[PDB]
Every structure is written in C-alpha cells, then in structure tokens.
Design a binder for this molecule. Structure first.
Ligand SMILES: Nc1ncnc2c1ncn2[C@@H]1O[C@H](COP(=O)(O)OP(=O)(O)NP(=O)(O)O)[C@@H](O)[C@H]1O
Ligand SMILES: Nc1ncnc2c1ncn2[C@@H]1O[C@H](COP(=O)(O)OP(=O)(O)NP(=O)(O)O)[C@@H](O)[C@H]1O
Ligand SMILES: Nc1ncnc2c1ncn2[C@@H]1O[C@H](COP(=O)(O)OP(=O)(O)NP(=O)(O)O)[C@@H](O)[C@H]1O
Ligand SMILES: [Mg+2]
Ligand SMILES: [Mg+2]
Ligand SMILES: [Mg+2]
Lengths: 404, 403, 402, 249
DNA sequence: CGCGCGCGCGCGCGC
DNA sequence: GCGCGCGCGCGCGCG
C-alpha cells in the first residue's frame, strides 16, 4: 500500500448508508465544480521569457504534457465514473457479524406460518459497464488520467484488514490473447500496490485457466472498484482465436465478482460490438459515450468552446515578437489544417513555435503553420483531407474515421 | 456453514413424507401468492425532491437494480423450480435406518415361501433438467435469483453430520473447457459455504480425470440440491466437438449423483441441442421455457401487462416539474424505441432522467426520449432496426434474436 | 561504467531529477552539429610511401570522414529533447511524500480543500520517425549524435543503473521474437551481463518473454529505444506487421520508454492504413531526408559545394592538384545524382583505380569508367533520377518521387 | 591445425597494435580481386579490436571534464562496425571459383591468440541452399564451421529440435565468438530460383549480419541471380559494398 | 535426493 | 494459411 488511512464521513445517499468502502472517497462534487478542478496550465514568469534559446525550447516543448483545458463533454464523463465506482460497492458491503441472528429469526418465523416469505439473500453483484468510443487523438487517455488522479488509488482500512484499491489501468493484449491480459494485470497491480505478484505467478508455467482464477482471487481479496481496459481495437483484425472469448470473460468478471469494467477504444472497435444483441447491450450498460472532433461552427454561429480553447493555447508563447491578440485570419488556418482533432492542434502549435524559434524570425504567422504542416506532418495527410472534403464516401475509406 | 438450524414442518405430499431434506424447506405456496412476493420498488419520500442535484442523480441511478415487477411469465418458472428443487430429494433421503432385518426377512421368505418377487434396492436418481432460453435482456438472472432467494442457501443438520447446500449458481466457462468449470464450482461453493476448497483442490496440477472426481465426491457429500449453470451459450466457442463432452458430463451428473441441473442462455445456444434426439430430449427433461419480448397488443385490445409495467415505472421520477400521469403519446413512442426489451425500456428511462436532470428542463417528453435514444444508446441500433422492420430476413442475421 | 555527478540545468521542469542532471549540459544547436566533424589526419611525409600502404590508408575515407549537413540541427535537438523528456515522468519522488498524501487526504475529506491531485507520476514518452533514402546516412548520423552521451551511468546514492539509449533493429520476417533476442543481445553487449543466456535459450512463449523484456527495460531505466530498418515490417505477411506496431505503441504508453523508428520510403505505406497508425508513428513530427539537390534555388547550393570541396582534400597522389575543375564536379553530381554514399564510394574507387593504373592523376573520364565498370547494379535505378521523369522514379518504393 | 600468432606491424595508421590484424602475413583482373579481399579482411578486423586498456580512467576523466570544464563534448564509445560486401557475377564454367580458392588459399584459415581467449577464423566458405530455404544455409554454417575447426555444433545445434529462431541467434553467437574475417558464399542462383515469398529474407539476414555482427560477407553467382539486385535500391546498394565484380573472359 | 509420471506448449506437416 | 498430431522438456511428488 501507500498507507492512506481511511476516515469515514457519510453522504446524502440512502443507498450508501454506512458503507465502509463508499465513505472513504472524496465527497460528492457538483457537476460544474467537478469539471473545473480538471483545469490545468503551464505557468511561466516574465524572467523565463528573457532566457536563452535552448532553455526556452526545452521548456516550451512541455506544453502537450501539462496544458489541459476542460470541455463540455467532461461534464458527462465525470458523472458516470462518479456513480460507477460508488455504485459497484453497494452490493459488496461487508455484512455485520450479527447476520446469522436475523437469518435464524426469519427462518423460524417463516417456518411456523405467520409470514409468507423472507429474503434470505442480501449480497448481489451491482457492477455495470460502459464504453467510450472516439477517434484517435480525442484526448481520452489524458482525460481519464486527470479525472482519476482526484481519487487515491490504494487506501488501507484499519478496523478490518482490507487493502482497498480504487482503480488500476491496463491495456488490451497486442495479439488479443487472454493469457497476456493477466500479466498486464499483475504488473499494473504490483506497481500500483506494493507487492511482487509478477514474480510469484508470472514466470511459472501455469495454464490459462489456473491463472485467470488467480487474477479473480487478487481482485476479490482487495476489492477493486473499477478496472479500465484501453486499446480494445486490438481485438479487431489479427485476433488469435477470437475476441468473443475475451469479451465474455469480461462479462463473467462483471457478473460474478462484481468489479465494474470500463472499455476504451477507437471506432475501429464497433466492428466487434455489433454481431448480436447480447454483445452490444452488455458491452455498454450506461450507454456509450461517443466523442467526435470539435467543429468550427455551431448551429448558427461559430463555436465558443473552440474559441476559448484556441485563445488559452495562444496565450502560451515564449516568442518575444508575439502578438497578444489573436486574429481570425490566422485562427481559420488552424481549423483548415487540423479539422478539430485535439492532438494536431497542439502539435502544430509546438512545432511552429520551434520552427519560428530556430529560423531566426521569432514571429508566428499564418504562413509558418502551413509551412510546418507541409513537412513535419506528412504521414498523417490523407486521413485529414477526407475530413476536409466532407463527402462520406471518401471518409469511409478509413475505419477509425467516423462518418458525419 | 452459516449454521441455519433446521426445523421440520410436515407437508401434504405423500411422496414427501418424513424426508429430512424436504420437510426442512420453506413451506409450499400457491404460484399466485409466490409471484406476488417478488414485488419491489425504490423507497422514495416526498422530501427527496428538495435535495442536491448530485444526490438526486445518484438516487436515480439505483433504479435498474431495485425496481422489479413480476410478470405473467413468473408463475410457470416459480412452479417449475418449486417442484424441481423438492422432487430431487426423494431418491436421496438418508432416512434409511435399520434396513438389515427387513431385507433379511424378505430374502428368507423369498428363498422359501410365498413371495415370488421382492424388491430390495429402491434408490433412484429422481432428478430432472430444465432449459430456460430467452432474449438478452428479458431478466433471466434477475428473476432467477429473486425467485430462488426465498430458500436458505445452506441448512445444517447435526442429528446427521451433513451440511445441505440447497442451490448453487455458477456461470459457464469462457472457452467451453471442463477444467475451468470446476474452478468456478469450487469458488462458488467456498464463497457460499464457509470453507477453503479453492486452494486445496484447485492449484495442484491435478488432471481433468481426478478434478471431476473430487467435484462429484464433494457434491455428493453436501447433498447439493440444484446446480444452475448460467451463460450456456458459451459452448458455441468450442467448435472442435468440445460441447458434447461438457453436455454429457452434466448428463452423467444427473444420472448418478442425482442433482437436478438448470441451463440458461440466449437463443444462440439453440444450435447446441439439435444434433441428435438425446440432446433435445434431455436438454428439456421437464419442459422448456422460452421467453420473448413483451408485446404491446396481444389482441385487438391493448395488453394490460405492459400498461401496468410502464405505469408502475412512471412514478419513480425525481424531476420536479413532472407530469401527473403518463401520456399515451409518450407511451406509444416508448415501445417504438425499446421494442419490448425489458433492459432497454428501463435504461432509456434512467438515462432520460439523467439527461433532463443535467439539461435543467426537469420533465420527460417524447423528443427528449428520442434524443437520448439516438445519442447514447448507439451500438444497439441495428438489432432494434431489425426488430422494428418485422420482416424475417432482417431478424435472421443476428443469432441472439428469435422470430 | 560511469560514476554519476550532478550538474543543474537551466530548465525549471528538469530540476531535481537525478536522471536528467547526470546527463551532459544543454548545448546550442550551432555547436552540436559543428562538434560532430571528423576527418583523417595526414602528413606531408606520407607522399613518399608504398602503393599498398597508400591504398590501405585511403580506403578508410568512408569510415572516418563526416561533414554535418544542414538537417542535423533538427535531428540533434529532437533527440536531446526526447531523451531529456523521457525521464520527466520517471523520477523517484516517493522520498517523504507520504505525509503530504495523508495531509491532503484529511484536508479534502473534511476541510475546505477539494481539488487535490494524487499520483502526479505519469508517462511523458513521444515517438519519432526517420524516413530517408538508402544512402542518406540515417545510421552513422545517429551513431554520431548519440556518441556524445555516455551509454550507462551508475548512480551511487541508490542501487539503480541507468542506460540512456539502446540500439536494436527489426530483422527477417517481422516477428516479435526477433526483437526480444535482439533486445537481449544489444543490452548485454552494451552492459556486460548474461541476459541472453538466462532468458533466450529457454522454451518461452512470446507473451511471457515480452514481459521479461518489459521488466528488464524498466529496471535499467531506458531513455530511448532505436529500432533501425523498420522496412522489414512491410513485405512480412500474417498479422505480425500490425501487432509489432501495437507492441511499440503500448511501450510508449505504460512503461514510458520513447521509441524512434528508422526506415526507407518502402515502409512509408506501413503507416498509411489508419489514423492511429500515423499519429502514433510520429509524435514530434516525422523527418523526411531528401537527397542533395544540385541547386537549392536559381543560385547553386552551398551545401554540395562545401561537401565536394572538403572531400577533395583527402587525396594522396604524387601529381595531385588542390584545385578542382567545374567539369569535374558537374559530372560528379551527374553520375551519383544526390545519393551521398555513392558519391564517397565513387571518389574512393576512382582514387584506387588511378593509383593502381600507373597514371597519378584524376580526371572525369576515369570517373565515368569507374562508374560504368564498378557500380553496375546501382545505375539502373539512378537513371530514373537522372532523367527527371516522375513515373520512372515512381516505379519503385525505395525512392521518393522528387 | 592452428598456428601461433607473430605480431609484425607495418607503417599504416588504421592498423596499429590490434592483434587481429598483425597476426596475418605481410600486406605486400585478379589483382583487383586480391586487393579487395585483403582490404575487406583488414577493415572488418578494424571495427572489433579489444586493444583498449584502462578505459574507465579515461571515460570518467572525460565525463568530469565535460560536466564542469571548458571542453565541449567527449566522444564515448569509439566502437564502430566496418563491414563491406561486393557482388561477384560470372558464369559457373568461367573460372571464378578457381581465382576465389586461389586468393583465399593464400591466408591461413584459422590462427591462434594466446593472451586472449579468441581463436579467430580468417575465412569460412559455405555453399548456398540446394532446396532453397532459410534453415539449410544455417545448418551449412554448422557443417562448414566444424569442418574448419574441431567442433561439435552439428550435434548440439545442427539437428537439435529448435526453430528457425534460436538457431539464428546461436549462429551469430558462434560467428562473433571466433570473429570471421569473411563469409564468402557461392551459387546464389537458388536463392530466388525457387521461393516461398522469402527471397529477400536471406538478404535481410545478410544485411543484419553486416550491420551489428560486423562480418564482411561475399556473394557469388552467375548472371541468373541478378533479379533480386534490381527491385529496389536498398538491395542494390547493399549488394555492392565495394562495387559488384562482373566476370568477363 | 533420484526417478517416474503427467502436462503444457511448441513445431511441423497435412488439408 | 490454419488445425491437428506428435514430441520434447520441466516440475513435483514419493520412497
Ligand atoms: N482537453 C485537452 N486539452 C488540451 N490538450 C489535450 C486535451 N486532450 C488531449 N490533449 C492533447 O492530446 C495529445 C495526446 O492525446 P491523447 O490523450 O494521448 O489521445 P488519446 O485518444 O487519449 N490516446 P490515443 O488512442 O492514442 O488517441 C497531447 O498533446 C495532449 O496535450
Ligand atoms: N420484471 C422486471 N422488472 C424490472 N426490471 C426488470 C425486470 N426484468 C428485467 N429487468 C431489468 O432488465 C435488466 C436485465 O437484467 P438481467 O438480469 O441481466 O437479464 P439477463 O437476461 O440475464 N441479461 P443477460 O445475462 O445478458 O441475458 C436489468 O436491469 C433488470 O433490472
Ligand atoms: N554526413 C556524411 N558525410 C559523409 N559521408 C556520409 C555522411 N553520412 C553518411 N555518409 C556515408 O554513409 C555511410 C553510412 O551511412 P549509410 O550506410 O547510408 O546509412 P543508411 O543507409 O542511411 N541507414 P540504412 O540504409 O537503413 O542502413 C558512411 O560510411 C559514409 O560513407
Ligand atoms: Mg490512448
Ligand atoms: Mg444473466
Ligand atoms: Mg542503417
């Protein structure tokens, strides 16, 4: 563990009444205020602007890692993860030691008449699942990292020895194998938790069945509240024997041990989720969260969200000949070269900053944007010309590129 | 061993006379009375409307797991399970006591005397089997262990040193291999019965030959009353003739040990029980129960079942500006979207409450319903398009669906 | 090995990180490329020597003659930024941070604060792609770039050994078990160990041996991985071509070791299948190295002129002439047509032919003779570039259209 | 049969105090062939010299000098891989193999180093695949190696139930354990006379061996096998390190 | 501590 | 190009 002792404050939900695993997480935040906490930026003083060439380049190449502007779509994502984690613990409440008294009293009072029936079972799996699908570059990995960074990963409960783990992030196996997802599970858990599960069960020549049972044993021992699997699109194309095997193992994981599972991938992963009704409505239990590139124009006016995003990005420059205000003439060159894909915007900005910084004419203009677009982004050209064209036939040539 | 102390109360069935494992069970109930006791709803007070938005949203998200209304398809299933649990104990009663002198007298009056024929071994495997197949979302698991939770999971006798496991629910194996199904059996047993069978019998490199032997021995020791294997559709994975091995293991388990077995799956498992007459005959050894999406109009008059279901669901709204009664216009487009699937009719309601709650217009209308249908319930559309068309060629493209 | 010393850098975010301060100091781009200059030292006494000795000392020119071009200013900065940014997320920060976590936890749970951020640790790895023609010097250039940094550094304060770069290559049929054996071989060649013997000969699956690769690469914290010749992933059949890229994409996602991929334009189309195979194949841009053109504009290009003038000085002939005629240089580019390796080999073979013929003079006729006689399997593809035809050049995937 | 090494040097800058070079006889259309083979042997021996002494003193002195002093940069790992590979094209009955065997007959095949635990072999001539596959040329490597020197890799790794995978790593390991000066190969027609989609995989192995292992290889064939040296410039450029030698009467 | 048995996986050949 | 059959090696359990 990292030894975060647990402190118990009750919340306003009747279904979370006196649950030790629920009342140990940061309290229920409002929708607007929760997405405000995700706001991050890179700060630079006036002294850092009067620095030499190499230090400025090295500290300006840090923007993609630390700059982050929340979006309106995060208002919907944060609500789901709030109830996924908290809701899955409802059925996994450690029962009071006085449970047998109630059972025996009910049994003796139903046996002799005077009571029609009695519920002899309380524990039942509550866990569910969802599926967020978006084009590559939609900023889903970083968004999930920054949302989950608010939660403490592993805590400790003093009264009874459970070393609760809230979440752990893994990725799908490169060949779609099921006996490799367990090695990633062990590696991620013995990195996040303080243990050596990779040594004990990793190099031993156990079978597929006798190590899946081991992963299921670690997860119910330290209650896991969410397991997130990324790069699901690897199940597509060259899957070894099949993908339905891994899918229905995850289904068993959701239904039996009550650990909610969240799946992440590109819309190349819709080809594995539409073959029958079961593999679709069970693939997403809170529905899907389909993310799309941001558009320059709203229903009847330019999109203000992109305006705020572009302005806040444009404020972060280390060029001495910078222009404080941002014109529409050079703003419109961004969208005609980026099409709203959130990665290309920041990468083009950083690459243009480096080019201007090193060309000797440290002024950013519309010309440098296309000048650096035409050399340093060549292997991604044809996938964005299709988005520029807007014709569905040219868009549908690529599986990741979702038709509008 | 939760140590529920057994109490013996007599019943009215002649064949269930002085059975230790039948008299110590919940008493016989009428199916109409039994189905009425599955009713449940979310507990809401009037003051819950004046609460924080987040708390109200979290309260709404608990609807899918607490609201449950019994339909007309629960009478038959309740009756079948109530007979199937309790008919398998006639051929396993350890009430046999001093059976030496009676057999000796019979032998010594058959070897010489007027008795042409006497019968000695009256033990029989009285078990049966069921096959419950329905659409993915009809409520097989929920209704199954809401019905089956009126029975105590484990009952203990001390006059006879036996621990009785009345039922045990296990899922199938992901790859259709008998090696994984015993690990699930042991985990379910030691997760319900307090014990440690998983480490003792599961991580040693025992072959498949002896692990099944240990499983049979343990199931016979604890007089298991019902084994329910869920997700039986997983056997379509083993297309190298590996489903026959798993099927005949359960057939053997019914013929000798005597535990009744229940099979549950989507209609994609219908390709399993059609290779020969034996599979189909024993797949439904006491009938088969097939479920379908609930229909809006059974006849010219509207169906009262769906009307009652949707009216009872409509009263669980924490939106403040709520309509007093459920309008016919929004009701007719409620079926038009879910098409009778019991999971989607509730998920649409929950997600529309969450959408109107976040948007600020705390009221449910048809337009918002279709907005939520298009935006968020996206991957399930082609199957619902096929169900909306009504033509057989569209439906005969997905294996899960039944015409 | 190297015993670490700690010198602070100018960057505010590269501060207190042991794996960054141990590296050489941040240098400017002008002196980074200028310091990467090599030549062979000669004396006037070598004029009177034997033919065999002269031939053996002039055959060494391609090995130790390196004049930086104008493109190296970008490559040096790119590699330095990648190496120093790889270690940003891989910094030991669990020194006394436990009390900070507990204080923040009790402040968020009970007090007035809400927006605490546990576990600032993450991955900051980005990928680079270098695609150029076979002869553009994309291998010896990278060798000279990373010859500046020490291979492995031993840090005394904690028993951790750091290796900053590792050089492997894709081989044969684009299988992952190629690169596990290659990875172990390179790692235990650079750092004296027996990793290949401990893990190679054993009967091990692909997915179990990749985990050992990941574990050992995370033990000796690796700041860069170079996979040269990724053109072997193109003609290779089955589902291995996409799965090797899958492995390299997930290597820069969890472990954090940045990956740089080097190939020829034959492997230009291994990425063009999808969007994710292209964005995740060039993180900080992709560098395409075109061959030297005769004129950058209406005026002649000074890069080629400087190259020829500096390369001309490395001659050892009795009747040698320091000056060179314009006719000599004009046919020099005509025969080779932009590809630098062919230039240096044509020069050295012409010098060898002149030395052994008995005529101690270099002339354009001898250059044409050594072009025709020796470079027989090289010219049928140089003809397309010499003729300047778009389709003739576009016949092959080895050479880009312009 | 192995002979002791007599280290006699000559007035050359590149070859100096490197035991793998001065353990060879004195340096002083067949003239070009002999000169080319000699220079590849010695240049390939250059890039693998373990003649270094107290590197750690020098390396740490340079590190400390760069970290604080006025010296710009220090060039760590001055260890290259000097390998070159020509193509030899000529008809089978012309007599190319006669000159080949005459030139490689001049130098001793295997020599002995006593101060170092290395017994390097100057040349190692295997024949190309008769059926045509990746495996048999590497088995041929074991057979030629154990014919050259008293060895038993034919039993340990020749017919051992391994794959096409681990055999290659062992072959490279035993190649650079006794560093080869030349890997000369004849009859390259059957490389692509028959195939299974893997005609260029053997050339991929050759390129990898002349990149990391650092052994200069030689390829010999009749004008039939020129098809693979025409498809793309990577194979065409690497197919002629010092330039191809087409044989004429 | 040595030998016997079984099981898991890897490679080659056949369809 | 994929599935099945065989063979090889390793590990644990018992006397
Ligand atoms: N909300 C955001 N604000 C600013 N930059 C962002 C945001 N989201 C993503 N980025 C940038 O997007 C780049 C990488 O996006 P990333 O999150 O890796 O894509 P991804 O879809 O989540 N993973 P992948 O499957 O490879 O596309 C980085 O440069 C981030 O700075
Ligand atoms: N009578 C009912 N009243 C209320 N909700 C119901 C009813 N029947 C089913 N549901 C809901 O339908 C959803 C599906 O439940 P579930 O138990 O998964 O059925 P299922 O058929 O086993 N799904 P699957 O295992 O994939 O076939 C749940 O959200 C239940 O709450
Ligand atoms: N800057 C340079 N100045 C002089 N010669 C150079 C230079 N760069 C490369 N060369 C020549 O190129 C040789 C090595 O580069 P080269 O073999 O072409 O690598 P590469 O072909 O680009 N990488 P690859 O084709 O994937 O193996 C050197 O020995 C030189 O002869
Ligand atoms: Mg991602
Ligand atoms: Mg179910
Ligand atoms: Mg190279």
């Amino acid at each position: 563990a990292t030894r975060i002792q647990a402190v118990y404050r009750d919340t306003g939900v009747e279904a979370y009444r006196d649950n030790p695993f629920i009342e140990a997480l940061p309290p229920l935040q409002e929708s607007v205020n929760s997405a405000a906490s995700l706001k991050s930026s890179l700060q630079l003083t006036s002294s850092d602007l009067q620095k030499s060439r190499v230090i400025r380049a090295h500290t300006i190449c840090r923007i993609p890692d630390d700059y982050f502007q929340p979006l309106g779509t995060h208002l919907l994502l944060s609500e789901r993860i709030s109830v996924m984690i908290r809701g899955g613990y409802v059925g996994r409440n450690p029962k009071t030691g006085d449970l047998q008294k109630h059972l025996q009293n009910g049994y003796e009072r139903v046996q002799t008449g005077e009571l029609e029936t009695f519920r002899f079972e309380e524990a039942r799996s509550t866990a569910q699942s969802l599926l967020l699908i978006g084009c590559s570059g939609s900023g889903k990995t970083t968004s999930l990292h920054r949302i989950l960074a608010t939660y403490p990963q592993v805590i400790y409960h003093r009264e009874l020895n459970v070393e609760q783990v809230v979440y752990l992030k893994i990725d799908c196996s490169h060949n779609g194998s099921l006996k490799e997802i367990c090695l990633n599970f062990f590696r991620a858990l013995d990195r996040a938790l303080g243990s050596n599960y990779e040594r004990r069960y990793g190099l031993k020549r156990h079978g597929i069945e006798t190590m899946l049972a081991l992963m299921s044993q670690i997860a119910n021992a330290h209650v896991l509240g969410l397991l997130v699997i990324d790069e699901i699109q690897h199940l597509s194309r060259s899957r070894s024997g099949g993908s339905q095997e891994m899918l229905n193992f995850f289904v068993t994981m959701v239904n039996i041990i009550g650990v909610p599972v969240m799946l992440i991938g590109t819309p190349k992963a819709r080809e594995i989720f539409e073959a029958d009704l079961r593999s679709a409505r069970r693939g997403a239990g809170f529905g899907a969260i389909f993310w799309d590139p941001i558009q320059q124009t709203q229903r009847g006016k330019p999109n203000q969200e992109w305006i705020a995003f572009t302005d806040n990005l444009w404020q972060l420059q280390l060029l001495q000949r910078k222009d404080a205000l941002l014109s529409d003439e050079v703003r419109d060159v961004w969208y005609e070269l980026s099409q709203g894909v959130m990665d290309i915007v920041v990468k083009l900005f950083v690459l243009a900053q480096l080019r201007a910084l090193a060309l000797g004419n440290e002024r950013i203009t519309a010309g440098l944007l296309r000048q650096v677009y035409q050399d340093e982004l060549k292997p991604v050209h044809p996938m964005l010309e299709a988005l520029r064209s807007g014709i569905p036939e040219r868009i549908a040539r690529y599986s990741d590129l979702v038709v509008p």
